[PDB]
Symmetry: C3
Subunit: 215 residues, 3 copies
């Protein structure tokens, strides 16, 4: 797994679940939680080891998948909760998932999909954070450690605690310029050339390089 | 212990501690935390294996017990903190638990009981939630994931985060109905007959069943 | 390891990292998380085992240290985040730690020290609490279970949740008295004699003893 906490495992090369969509360079640094990204960070997703056979038989059908963009930093212990409500329905008299074996016919399947969990590009997710099912995280967003995300996260927003939005990393205009140029989609050599600008707050410099050289 | 995350260990089968009392059909689905319910979920409860020979000595006083109702759904990582204050006294000059062997006979024992933590029936406890000592949880309540419950939970209420009370599952009249009919105490065949109403929101239909069949 | 949750490993006798200072009698009780104080509780601090070879080479120079006082109680899962920002810079266009091997030499290191994490004396840190980098915790303070401390904690204050200050343990003048007498620094004999007073809320008697015999 991880020999040290200075280690960062590339995700697109490793993940095998046909329901986890990762981008380039995105990594999971989970040394202090031992297990890999697919058996510790992604939870209750059909198409894994302990669940592979059940997924290949096609018993449950289509699933909610996890999509992660490029240049994402996923810290140790971060958790992506899938499988939606897992059969529990608060609007029903009972939240207990009765089984047809023990309780016969008339058992209505309470499961209902919550939608795909989508993580944008250049997203930093803090250690031991937890994402709820069906949550969209915009590009450039930052998730604090031990945060519990229940709602969609605006791009370049910073969210702490139990879905407390602190601030946006930049002015709204500059945020929209970054959302238009999309440096993460650039060819590698352009990113290598503009790395000095990327290691800075000078957004409009990056925009000028984009207009002159990329777009 | 757990071979998959669609597995749920029935609790009243496999719990050995005389200080735990769990009702029928209540399960714990703890795949993503490996160990069993008594090893991971219940913590600092005198009578488990690592303290057995010390607890059978009777040197400690009476301790608070854990009682869980029936048809409870305990997700992975949920935790029931026991042992009260564990000897730490915030009202004392020092919260450090001095040992008699190291600091002499003048050591006063600071442990104080908190009361039995009691969980009702048809209670859904989210993943990695943590219940503090002395807490009663009403029937039909829902505890959100990663929630920290420090106060008593009203029946059929939904509590998230740091004991933030979101709402109640139904109108108070219908919750009174559910509280007086108590479908969890019914014989099994009546539950099998009313399964399709239990998988619905029509409470007064179920109450008509209780009136005309159960008593 | 940990035989039971009733035992707590003495930290001063055990800690090997040179970047960690810990006072007398302070213990770590971490049975419900298995591994030692230095592998589970202290995270992302060079000098431990998996990074020892990196620390001996002087590759990253000086680093933030962890300083723990005397008579501290650290429960299982209490985690101290080190390594500051880990190269992630919210102020820059990208929070991604680009590597000089994969990208151009124009990569600028975004790591930043957060200052030493300092825990005072007579501190009780609840189970699975998280202490962010650079946090100072005053003497006699109490951290609640699963609390996330991101600011400095005043001496003899109770902090639960996400840096929610509940109250202070005693009156301000008595807190001052404790902060001036500092019983934890006394010769162990005087602590032994005072044991009946420390196991109480009688700060005045402790001050009288200090005036008569210690000061
Ligand atoms: Cl990271
Ligand atoms: Cl189901
Ligand atoms: Cl690319
Ligand atoms: Cl569940
Ligand atoms: Cl403790
Ligand atoms: Mg510039
Ligand atoms: Mg109906
Ligand atoms: Mg006295």
């Amino acid at each position: 797994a991880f020999n040290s906490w200075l280690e960062g495992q590339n995700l697109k090369e490793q993940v095998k679940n046909p329901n986890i969509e990762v981008g380039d360079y995105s990594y999971y640094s989970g040394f202090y939680h031992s297990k890999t990204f697919e058996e510790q960070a992604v939870r209750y997703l059909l198409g894994d080891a302990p669940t592979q056979e059940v997924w290949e038989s096609g018993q449950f059908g289509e699933v909610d998948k996890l999509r992660i963009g490029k240049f994402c930093s996923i810290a140790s212990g971060a958790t992506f909760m899938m499988a939606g409500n897992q059969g529990h329905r608060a609007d029903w008299i009972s939240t207990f998932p009765f089984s047809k074996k023990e309780f016969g016919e008339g058992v209505k399947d309470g499961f209902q999909r919550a939608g795909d969990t989508i993580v944008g590009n250049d997203v930093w997710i803090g250690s031991e954070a937890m994402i709820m099912p069906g949550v969209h995280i915009g590009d450039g967003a930052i998730i604090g450690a031990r945060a519990v995300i229940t709602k969609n996260v605006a791009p370049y927003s910073v969210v702490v605690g139990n879905n407390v939005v602190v601030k946006k990393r930049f002015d709204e205009n500059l945020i929209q310029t970054l959302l238009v140029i999309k440096w993460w989609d650039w060819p590698l050599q352009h990113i290598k050339n503009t790395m000095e600008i990327l290691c800075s707050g000078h957004i409009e410099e990056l925009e000028q390089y984009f207009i002159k050289n990329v777009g």
